[PDB]
Amino acid sequence: RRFPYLRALSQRVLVFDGAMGTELQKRDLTPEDYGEEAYYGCPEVLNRTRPDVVREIHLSYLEAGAEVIETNSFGALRHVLAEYGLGEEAEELAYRAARIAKEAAEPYGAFVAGALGPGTKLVSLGQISWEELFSAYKEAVRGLVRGGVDLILLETAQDILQVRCAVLAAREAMAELGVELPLQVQVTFEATGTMLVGTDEQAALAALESLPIDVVGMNCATGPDLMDAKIRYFAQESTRFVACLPNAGLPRNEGGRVVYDLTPEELARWHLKFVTEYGVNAVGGCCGTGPEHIRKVAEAVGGRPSPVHKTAFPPQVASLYQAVPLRQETSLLLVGERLNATGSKRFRELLFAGDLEGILALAQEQVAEGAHVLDLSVAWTGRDELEDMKRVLSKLATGVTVPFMVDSTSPEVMEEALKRLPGRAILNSANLEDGLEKFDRVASLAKAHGAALVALAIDEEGMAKTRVKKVEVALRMYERLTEHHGLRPEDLLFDLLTFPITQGDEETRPLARETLLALEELRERLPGVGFVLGVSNVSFGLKPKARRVLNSVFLDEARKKGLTAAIVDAGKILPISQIPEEAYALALDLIYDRREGQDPLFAFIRFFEEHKEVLAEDKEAFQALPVEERLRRRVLEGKRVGLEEDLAEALGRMRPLEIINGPLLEAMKEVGELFGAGKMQLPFVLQAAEVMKQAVAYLEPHMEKKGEGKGKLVLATVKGDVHDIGKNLVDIILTNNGYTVYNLGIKVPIEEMLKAVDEVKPHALGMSGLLVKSTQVMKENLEYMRARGYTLPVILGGAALTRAYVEELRSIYPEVYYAEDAFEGLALMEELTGHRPKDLT
Ligand code: B12
Ligand SMILES: [Zn+2]
């Protein structure tokens, strides 16, 4: 109700113009119209000399019934006006083409979208530094706002850091005129699954949630039939309203003019589909479309009631490349802290000379390890961390595939890191260590610069040891953090000191109890929040084996008491399912200091002095276990020393198929059951996956293939998935039986899969999933594959897949199924190949 363009978008669906390319390419402006010999061919040079010609292109879409019009602003930026010195006065031009667009639109009332391009220079590939783009956007955009546009479009953006500096620049441009508006970023896309920079469709939206921009959208995409996947994930998933502008397919240059072949009738179908089915709040197509496209869309599709989108995006964070969900509640998020020179010293060996190529290895090795947010701190004696942080992020921001956390000390890095990082991060600036003043500005920086914080229970006083003062952390910060400083519970972690218990003092001995009772007392009221604990530090000032075991049983009760994330190094925990029965009883009553009969601490230490060979390279009691348990335990701890030899022993006893029917389905499944019960954590499940992954590569060559030319079969996972364990075997028994095969990767969004249909023209296509949300994606595939008129065999499965939300799909598509096992997958391939008795009905 506060803004006319949101009154429009919330009510009903409206249409954007075509662009002025194919339209200025049809006016035959001749070089005197550039006003100078050196200003060749420059739109945004014409705005000075020939206002009447661009007014002619403006009014053409207005006569053809458009409802949103771009200003000319494709060049409104210093570093692209000056590209051949073509006039430094951006503001002028911006108030010029905004006035030219208003002069045309005023009788019609169609919305003036101050509508930029992306500029010629990118932040994220290091073509330019943030100040030189932020300056250009900052000075330009205030002339558009002075020009009285109904909103700004930062449209066609090519990089999320280019979005960030453009949004910061547009905000500081509008705010220094005393205003703000429902501004609209919109993003390009490429068939690689991504923007041009490598940003995927999840990273785009997960980043764009962090921003007050009430509208988001797409632009300069390659046509509706290629935009559909992207428009999907945006329209059904986002809170902020979505809009659509395909460039009419793909270009073809004639006589120096770009021209297309998508028709006004076809663009009427595609918006008629998208607007009521998916809910797209505004529509059009700009580059490559005449005024007839927008007319034929306006008559068919304009004024339809704009459909609602959901009240919440999940708990999320985003790198350049990919999103991550912030709340796991199973396989709790692991946070990597090895990028630390102040709470650790590994970082300090590699980063000392300024060797940035070395700090990136220390970042990426923690993801392979298992941690999917990294925590960074370069602070040290006799070194300026805020200058170091210039150098540090110049490598990390475009190298690391996972989001960031920031243990670095000065809140001035809170600003400089948020001026060199893409996406959405978190920061450990809420250490309440310099008091409430410093905290409220830290919580403001968290969002004034997009999105970045973690609560830490350090404070002006120090490390909360008594719980009343510890829950008074959450009382001081959280409420004003979410409800005065913008980051949701689902945008934050929460962290409790994890101080040493094991020094043996009657101060220290109980303290893991303090953390578990608090943690619980805190999830007690923190739903959605990823509780994050620095597990490594509970066991400090004692022998290292008692560090693995106490850290382990602390962490693995912490999930049951309410944990969802942890700051970890996987070398300094083990799983609670491994722990010897006496050692587990010891470790619990040590975590409680529930002492009777003997003291738990010196009982513990003397337990490890008595049981030295148990939690080591055990030459006997572990070896004496039956191989199915031994493999179960290798899958639980991630034991690999002799893993090759125990799988060789299993393969000596039984055939691979009998082994994969056995422990290489069953023992994993038991690890999965124990994992669902909380008896394990992410890096141990990653050790289980790595065990399988390795094992399948040893099982497949002995289970050797036969036959040739049997058919063409491709396989495909689904959007939002990370698993491909099932997938691999779902494929494998089909790959073993003479069919030509192509494999699609772990997370493939659908237009890549359908391009593989269109290019390969196979006899069969795999679909797949190992988790619940694959089912929801199955229906999204099948409903639209039908709307495109496909008839190809696509096969459907997954740990989760179940006939109850699958046989009903037979209605939507003529190829619904559930091979459960890849041996049925082969029997079903032979049916749809015509080799076997089709019985599928
Ligand atoms: C190993 C594992 C992981 C691995 C996966 C790596 C990998 N590449 O596989 C990793 C550690 C990366 C992982 C990640 C996650 N996981 Co996980 N994972 C597991 C686990 C233990 C085993 C999965 C397994 O491999 N099963 C064995 C394979 C062989 O069996 P299958 O998948 O069922 O395959 C059979 C049939 O399903 C069929 N089939 C499967 N696909 C298809 C397709 C077609 C077309 C056909 C006809 C047949 C078919 O064929 C096979 C028989 O041959 C499961 C537990 C479980 N219940 O299985 C959880 C589990 C799937 N994970 C879970 C969760 C919680 C997560 C994460 C959210 C954890 C996190 N990061 O916080 C993420 C998800 C990340 C993401 N973006 O997707 C939950 C999901 C529950 C839910 N309802 O959402 C599960 C079910 C466990 C649980 N109980 O919490 N996990
Ligand atoms: Zn465009």
mmCIF file of C-alpha atoms in Angstrom, residues 538-799:
data_model
loop_
_atom_site.group_PDB
_atom_site.id
_atom_site.type_symbol
_atom_site.label_atom_id
_atom_site.label_comp_id
_atom_site.label_asym_id
_atom_site.label_seq_id
_atom_site.Cartn_x
_atom_site.Cartn_y
_atom_site.Cartn_z
ATOM 1 C CA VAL A 538 35.917 -28.486 26.485
ATOM 2 C CA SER A 539 38.818 -30.901 26.880
ATOM 3 C CA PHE A 540 41.873 -28.711 27.501
ATOM 4 C CA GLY A 541 44.852 -29.188 29.973
ATOM 5 C CA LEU A 542 44.848 -33.028 29.715
ATOM 6 C CA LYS A 543 46.159 -35.990 27.639
ATOM 7 C CA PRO A 544 44.932 -36.021 23.974
ATOM 8 C CA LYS A 545 42.828 -39.285 23.914
ATOM 9 C CA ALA A 546 40.597 -37.871 26.638
ATOM 10 C CA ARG A 547 40.213 -34.880 24.229
ATOM 11 C CA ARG A 548 38.714 -37.078 21.432
ATOM 12 C CA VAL A 549 36.449 -38.958 23.891
ATOM 13 C CA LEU A 550 35.255 -36.049 26.071
ATOM 14 C CA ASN A 551 34.762 -33.778 22.999
ATOM 15 C CA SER A 552 32.868 -36.572 21.236
ATOM 16 C CA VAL A 553 30.436 -37.390 24.098
ATOM 17 C CA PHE A 554 29.969 -33.661 24.790
ATOM 18 C CA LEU A 555 29.052 -32.997 21.094
ATOM 19 C CA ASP A 556 26.999 -36.147 20.692
ATOM 20 C CA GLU A 557 24.943 -35.416 23.777
ATOM 21 C CA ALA A 558 24.804 -31.751 22.614
ATOM 22 C CA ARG A 559 22.675 -32.687 19.591
ATOM 23 C CA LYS A 560 20.181 -34.494 21.900
ATOM 24 C CA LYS A 561 20.252 -31.408 24.159
ATOM 25 C CA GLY A 562 19.665 -29.123 21.132
ATOM 26 C CA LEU A 563 22.621 -28.629 18.872
ATOM 27 C CA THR A 564 22.460 -28.024 15.052
ATOM 28 C CA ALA A 565 25.902 -26.632 14.160
ATOM 29 C CA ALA A 566 29.466 -26.914 15.582
ATOM 30 C CA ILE A 567 32.938 -25.309 15.228
ATOM 31 C CA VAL A 568 35.068 -28.374 14.738
ATOM 32 C CA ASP A 569 38.134 -30.001 13.401
ATOM 33 C CA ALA A 570 37.158 -33.624 12.522
ATOM 34 C CA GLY A 571 40.548 -34.848 13.889
ATOM 35 C CA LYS A 572 39.395 -33.834 17.455
ATOM 36 C CA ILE A 573 36.045 -35.646 17.891
ATOM 37 C CA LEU A 574 34.813 -39.257 17.312
ATOM 38 C CA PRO A 575 31.184 -40.693 17.233
ATOM 39 C CA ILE A 576 29.340 -41.608 20.502
ATOM 40 C CA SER A 577 28.395 -45.003 18.959
ATOM 41 C CA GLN A 578 32.109 -46.031 18.922
ATOM 42 C CA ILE A 579 32.872 -45.233 22.617
ATOM 43 C CA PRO A 580 33.588 -48.260 24.935
ATOM 44 C CA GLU A 581 30.634 -48.877 27.327
ATOM 45 C CA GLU A 582 32.705 -48.029 30.458
ATOM 46 C CA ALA A 583 34.329 -45.024 28.694
ATOM 47 C CA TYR A 584 30.853 -43.722 27.680
ATOM 48 C CA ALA A 585 29.538 -44.131 31.247
ATOM 49 C CA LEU A 586 32.752 -42.375 32.432
ATOM 50 C CA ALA A 587 32.468 -39.609 29.809
ATOM 51 C CA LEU A 588 28.823 -38.812 30.675
ATOM 52 C CA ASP A 589 29.414 -38.732 34.446
ATOM 53 C CA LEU A 590 32.591 -36.672 33.708
ATOM 54 C CA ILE A 591 30.532 -34.224 31.530
ATOM 55 C CA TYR A 592 28.190 -33.983 34.539
ATOM 56 C CA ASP A 593 30.914 -34.472 37.209
ATOM 57 C CA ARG A 594 28.366 -36.815 38.716
ATOM 58 C CA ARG A 595 30.944 -38.344 41.031
ATOM 59 C CA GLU A 596 30.442 -41.485 43.196
ATOM 60 C CA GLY A 597 32.694 -44.531 44.035
ATOM 61 C CA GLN A 598 35.666 -42.944 42.267
ATOM 62 C CA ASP A 599 36.381 -39.476 40.788
ATOM 63 C CA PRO A 600 35.384 -39.229 37.137
ATOM 64 C CA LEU A 601 38.400 -37.195 35.958
ATOM 65 C CA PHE A 602 41.248 -39.318 37.375
ATOM 66 C CA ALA A 603 39.145 -42.419 36.596
ATOM 67 C CA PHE A 604 39.027 -41.181 33.067
ATOM 68 C CA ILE A 605 42.745 -40.485 32.714
ATOM 69 C CA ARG A 606 43.556 -43.853 34.408
ATOM 70 C CA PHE A 607 41.056 -45.535 32.029
ATOM 71 C CA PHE A 608 43.157 -44.301 29.072
ATOM 72 C CA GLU A 609 46.337 -45.434 30.933
ATOM 73 C CA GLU A 610 44.719 -48.933 31.314
ATOM 74 C CA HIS A 611 43.044 -49.057 27.834
ATOM 75 C CA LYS A 612 45.842 -47.481 25.663
ATOM 76 C CA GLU A 613 45.526 -49.898 22.683
ATOM 77 C CA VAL A 614 41.663 -49.662 22.426
ATOM 78 C CA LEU A 615 41.362 -46.133 20.908
ATOM 79 C CA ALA A 616 44.407 -46.676 18.619
ATOM 80 C CA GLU A 617 45.546 -48.931 15.688
ATOM 81 C CA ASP A 618 44.067 -51.916 17.535
ATOM 82 C CA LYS A 619 45.787 -55.151 16.516
ATOM 83 C CA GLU A 620 43.285 -57.453 18.268
ATOM 84 C CA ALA A 621 39.828 -56.721 19.709
ATOM 85 C CA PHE A 622 38.749 -54.659 16.653
ATOM 86 C CA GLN A 623 40.291 -57.309 14.296
ATOM 87 C CA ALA A 624 38.414 -60.113 16.156
ATOM 88 C CA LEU A 625 34.992 -58.546 15.248
ATOM 89 C CA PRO A 626 32.981 -60.157 12.367
ATOM 90 C CA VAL A 627 33.699 -58.276 9.100
ATOM 91 C CA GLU A 628 30.096 -56.959 8.857
ATOM 92 C CA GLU A 629 30.557 -55.228 12.230
ATOM 93 C CA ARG A 630 34.077 -54.230 11.360
ATOM 94 C CA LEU A 631 32.789 -52.617 8.105
ATOM 95 C CA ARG A 632 29.837 -51.125 10.108
ATOM 96 C CA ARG A 633 32.441 -49.552 12.467
ATOM 97 C CA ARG A 634 34.679 -48.386 9.557
ATOM 98 C CA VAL A 635 31.525 -46.677 8.182
ATOM 99 C CA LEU A 636 30.789 -45.215 11.705
ATOM 100 C CA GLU A 637 34.269 -43.752 12.646
ATOM 101 C CA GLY A 638 35.488 -43.393 9.075
ATOM 102 C CA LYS A 639 38.206 -45.979 9.612
ATOM 103 C CA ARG A 640 40.295 -46.391 6.483
ATOM 104 C CA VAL A 641 43.528 -47.966 7.634
ATOM 105 C CA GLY A 642 42.845 -51.559 6.435
ATOM 106 C CA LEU A 643 39.430 -50.613 4.873
ATOM 107 C CA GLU A 644 40.802 -51.853 1.505
ATOM 108 C CA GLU A 645 41.798 -55.183 3.163
ATOM 109 C CA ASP A 646 38.414 -55.744 4.920
ATOM 110 C CA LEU A 647 36.565 -55.070 1.639
ATOM 111 C CA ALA A 648 39.068 -57.442 -0.077
ATOM 112 C CA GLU A 649 38.234 -59.995 2.711
ATOM 113 C CA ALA A 650 34.462 -59.486 2.090
ATOM 114 C CA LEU A 651 35.032 -59.810 -1.730
ATOM 115 C CA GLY A 652 37.083 -63.004 -1.041
ATOM 116 C CA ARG A 653 34.167 -64.461 1.009
ATOM 117 C CA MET A 654 31.266 -63.356 -1.303
ATOM 118 C CA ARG A 655 30.528 -61.815 -4.724
ATOM 119 C CA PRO A 656 30.099 -58.081 -4.923
ATOM 120 C CA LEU A 657 26.360 -58.397 -5.517
ATOM 121 C CA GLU A 658 26.011 -60.546 -2.383
ATOM 122 C CA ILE A 659 28.154 -57.935 -0.506
ATOM 123 C CA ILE A 660 26.099 -54.944 -1.756
ATOM 124 C CA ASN A 661 22.913 -56.905 -0.930
ATOM 125 C CA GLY A 662 24.699 -57.445 2.455
ATOM 126 C CA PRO A 663 26.660 -54.776 4.475
ATOM 127 C CA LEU A 664 27.136 -52.416 1.458
ATOM 128 C CA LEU A 665 23.360 -51.811 1.725
ATOM 129 C CA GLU A 666 22.550 -53.095 5.258
ATOM 130 C CA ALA A 667 25.456 -51.808 7.416
ATOM 131 C CA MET A 668 25.346 -48.438 5.732
ATOM 132 C CA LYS A 669 21.573 -48.443 6.366
ATOM 133 C CA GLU A 670 22.351 -49.187 10.033
ATOM 134 C CA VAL A 671 24.778 -46.225 10.013
ATOM 135 C CA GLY A 672 21.904 -44.191 8.515
ATOM 136 C CA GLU A 673 19.527 -45.401 11.287
ATOM 137 C CA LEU A 674 22.111 -44.476 13.972
ATOM 138 C CA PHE A 675 22.746 -41.134 12.201
ATOM 139 C CA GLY A 676 18.976 -40.363 12.231
ATOM 140 C CA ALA A 677 18.959 -41.277 15.971
ATOM 141 C CA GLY A 678 21.873 -38.786 16.451
ATOM 142 C CA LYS A 679 24.681 -41.364 17.252
ATOM 143 C CA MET A 680 26.962 -39.759 14.563
ATOM 144 C CA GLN A 681 27.672 -36.265 13.021
ATOM 145 C CA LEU A 682 28.356 -34.859 9.474
ATOM 146 C CA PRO A 683 32.141 -35.652 8.988
ATOM 147 C CA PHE A 684 31.511 -39.249 10.064
ATOM 148 C CA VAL A 685 28.610 -39.496 7.541
ATOM 149 C CA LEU A 686 31.036 -37.953 4.977
ATOM 150 C CA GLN A 687 33.511 -40.709 5.982
ATOM 151 C CA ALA A 688 30.619 -43.163 5.360
ATOM 152 C CA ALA A 689 29.915 -41.639 1.953
ATOM 153 C CA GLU A 690 33.666 -41.685 1.123
ATOM 154 C CA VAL A 691 33.764 -45.361 2.260
ATOM 155 C CA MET A 692 30.883 -46.199 -0.099
ATOM 156 C CA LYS A 693 32.299 -44.101 -2.916
ATOM 157 C CA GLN A 694 35.596 -45.932 -2.559
ATOM 158 C CA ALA A 695 33.959 -49.340 -2.131
ATOM 159 C CA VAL A 696 31.784 -49.081 -5.316
ATOM 160 C CA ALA A 697 35.009 -48.419 -7.301
ATOM 161 C CA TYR A 698 36.443 -51.739 -5.912
ATOM 162 C CA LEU A 699 33.145 -53.690 -6.389
ATOM 163 C CA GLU A 700 32.342 -52.507 -9.980
ATOM 164 C CA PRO A 701 35.519 -53.936 -11.737
ATOM 165 C CA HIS A 702 34.929 -57.475 -10.301
ATOM 166 C CA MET A 703 31.183 -57.088 -11.118
ATOM 167 C CA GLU A 704 32.360 -56.473 -14.734
ATOM 168 C CA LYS A 705 29.938 -55.453 -17.541
ATOM 169 C CA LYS A 706 28.678 -57.400 -20.613
ATOM 170 C CA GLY A 707 26.908 -56.786 -23.987
ATOM 171 C CA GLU A 708 26.943 -53.819 -26.445
ATOM 172 C CA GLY A 709 24.604 -51.356 -28.252
ATOM 173 C CA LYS A 710 21.552 -52.241 -26.030
ATOM 174 C CA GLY A 711 20.176 -48.627 -26.103
ATOM 175 C CA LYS A 712 20.917 -44.961 -25.107
ATOM 176 C CA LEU A 713 20.414 -44.132 -21.419
ATOM 177 C CA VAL A 714 21.309 -41.032 -19.420
ATOM 178 C CA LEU A 715 20.885 -40.521 -15.675
ATOM 179 C CA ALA A 716 20.001 -37.419 -13.682
ATOM 180 C CA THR A 717 19.821 -36.253 -10.075
ATOM 181 C CA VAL A 718 17.692 -33.412 -8.927
ATOM 182 C CA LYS A 719 17.860 -29.714 -7.818
ATOM 183 C CA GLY A 720 18.732 -29.080 -4.133
ATOM 184 C CA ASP A 721 20.236 -32.632 -3.747
ATOM 185 C CA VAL A 722 23.831 -33.307 -2.610
ATOM 186 C CA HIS A 723 23.620 -37.038 -2.473
ATOM 187 C CA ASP A 724 24.408 -39.334 -5.340
ATOM 188 C CA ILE A 725 25.123 -42.531 -3.426
ATOM 189 C CA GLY A 726 21.881 -44.137 -4.447
ATOM 190 C CA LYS A 727 22.291 -42.422 -7.800
ATOM 191 C CA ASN A 728 25.568 -44.200 -8.575
ATOM 192 C CA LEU A 729 24.141 -47.643 -8.001
ATOM 193 C CA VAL A 730 20.735 -46.654 -9.473
ATOM 194 C CA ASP A 731 22.792 -46.128 -12.608
ATOM 195 C CA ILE A 732 25.337 -48.902 -12.252
ATOM 196 C CA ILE A 733 23.371 -52.124 -12.984
ATOM 197 C CA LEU A 734 22.111 -50.306 -16.141
ATOM 198 C CA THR A 735 25.703 -49.253 -17.092
ATOM 199 C CA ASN A 736 26.805 -52.931 -16.631
ATOM 200 C CA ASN A 737 24.427 -54.274 -19.391
ATOM 201 C CA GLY A 738 25.626 -52.817 -22.744
ATOM 202 C CA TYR A 739 23.701 -49.563 -22.968
ATOM 203 C CA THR A 740 25.442 -46.312 -24.096
ATOM 204 C CA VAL A 741 25.342 -43.899 -21.168
ATOM 205 C CA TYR A 742 25.649 -40.237 -20.180
ATOM 206 C CA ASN A 743 25.778 -39.128 -16.499
ATOM 207 C CA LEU A 744 24.335 -35.842 -15.154
ATOM 208 C CA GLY A 745 25.820 -34.387 -11.909
ATOM 209 C CA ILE A 746 24.809 -34.267 -8.212
ATOM 210 C CA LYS A 747 22.447 -31.222 -8.277
ATOM 211 C CA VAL A 748 21.274 -30.734 -11.914
ATOM 212 C CA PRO A 749 18.406 -28.169 -12.389
ATOM 213 C CA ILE A 750 15.931 -29.228 -15.042
ATOM 214 C CA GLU A 751 16.690 -27.250 -18.233
ATOM 215 C CA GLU A 752 20.144 -28.932 -18.430
ATOM 216 C CA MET A 753 18.419 -32.320 -18.185
ATOM 217 C CA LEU A 754 15.910 -31.367 -20.886
ATOM 218 C CA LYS A 755 18.751 -30.035 -23.107
ATOM 219 C CA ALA A 756 20.260 -33.551 -22.709
ATOM 220 C CA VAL A 757 16.869 -34.983 -23.867
ATOM 221 C CA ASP A 758 16.842 -32.545 -26.805
ATOM 222 C CA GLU A 759 20.526 -33.184 -27.764
ATOM 223 C CA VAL A 760 21.002 -36.931 -27.012
ATOM 224 C CA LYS A 761 17.396 -38.131 -27.820
ATOM 225 C CA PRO A 762 17.881 -41.253 -25.598
ATOM 226 C CA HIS A 763 15.691 -44.362 -25.097
ATOM 227 C CA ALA A 764 15.664 -43.662 -21.294
ATOM 228 C CA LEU A 765 16.425 -40.875 -18.758
ATOM 229 C CA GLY A 766 17.098 -41.440 -15.019
ATOM 230 C CA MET A 767 15.525 -39.017 -12.491
ATOM 231 C CA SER A 768 16.552 -39.356 -8.758
ATOM 232 C CA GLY A 769 16.801 -38.465 -5.050
ATOM 233 C CA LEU A 770 18.085 -39.587 -1.582
ATOM 234 C CA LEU A 771 16.113 -37.123 0.531
ATOM 235 C CA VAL A 772 12.590 -35.909 1.148
ATOM 236 C CA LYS A 773 12.760 -32.669 -0.937
ATOM 237 C CA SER A 774 13.542 -34.668 -4.021
ATOM 238 C CA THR A 775 9.867 -35.836 -4.004
ATOM 239 C CA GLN A 776 8.653 -32.185 -4.189
ATOM 240 C CA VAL A 777 11.076 -31.629 -7.117
ATOM 241 C CA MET A 778 9.793 -34.818 -8.839
ATOM 242 C CA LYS A 779 6.312 -33.274 -9.147
ATOM 243 C CA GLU A 780 7.867 -29.987 -10.428
ATOM 244 C CA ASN A 781 9.608 -31.969 -13.206
ATOM 245 C CA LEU A 782 6.598 -34.112 -14.134
ATOM 246 C CA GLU A 783 4.030 -31.312 -14.241
ATOM 247 C CA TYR A 784 6.155 -29.210 -16.606
ATOM 248 C CA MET A 785 7.667 -31.986 -18.743
ATOM 249 C CA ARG A 786 3.944 -32.561 -19.587
ATOM 250 C CA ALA A 787 3.351 -28.831 -20.264
ATOM 251 C CA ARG A 788 6.234 -29.088 -22.810
ATOM 252 C CA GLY A 789 4.656 -32.172 -24.452
ATOM 253 C CA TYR A 790 7.499 -34.656 -23.671
ATOM 254 C CA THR A 791 6.888 -38.469 -23.967
ATOM 255 C CA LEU A 792 10.395 -39.845 -23.159
ATOM 256 C CA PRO A 793 10.804 -42.649 -20.549
ATOM 257 C CA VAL A 794 12.023 -40.964 -17.380
ATOM 258 C CA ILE A 795 12.483 -43.447 -14.425
ATOM 259 C CA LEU A 796 11.764 -42.195 -10.718
ATOM 260 C CA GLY A 797 13.326 -43.235 -7.305
ATOM 261 C CA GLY A 798 14.974 -42.523 -4.008
ATOM 262 C CA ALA A 799 15.428 -43.555 -0.428
#
